């Protein structure tokens, strides 16, 4: 209470928890983007110069 306010305990516990969760979320971001259908161009009908129809 000399330096910090009353909810410093609240903010510090939430900050350590949030740091763990953003590490987990950044790993989830990297994994999702490297497996994404945008990255590997999966289920994307890539346009050909004639538009052949199979």
């Amino acid at each position: 209470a000399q330096i910090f306010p009353r909810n410093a305990n609240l903010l510090s516990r939430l900050s350590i928890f949030a740091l763990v969760l953003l590490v987990v979320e950044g790993i989830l971001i990297l994994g999702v983007y490297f497996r994404s259908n945008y990255f590997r161009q999966v289920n994307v009908a890539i346009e050909q110069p004639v538009a052949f129809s199979h």
Binding site: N37, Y38, V42, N43, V44, A45
Partner: peptide
């Protein structure tokens, strides 16, 4: 990009 629904 979900799986396309090819028109029947």
């Amino acid at each position: 990009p979900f799986t396309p629904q090819p028109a029947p």
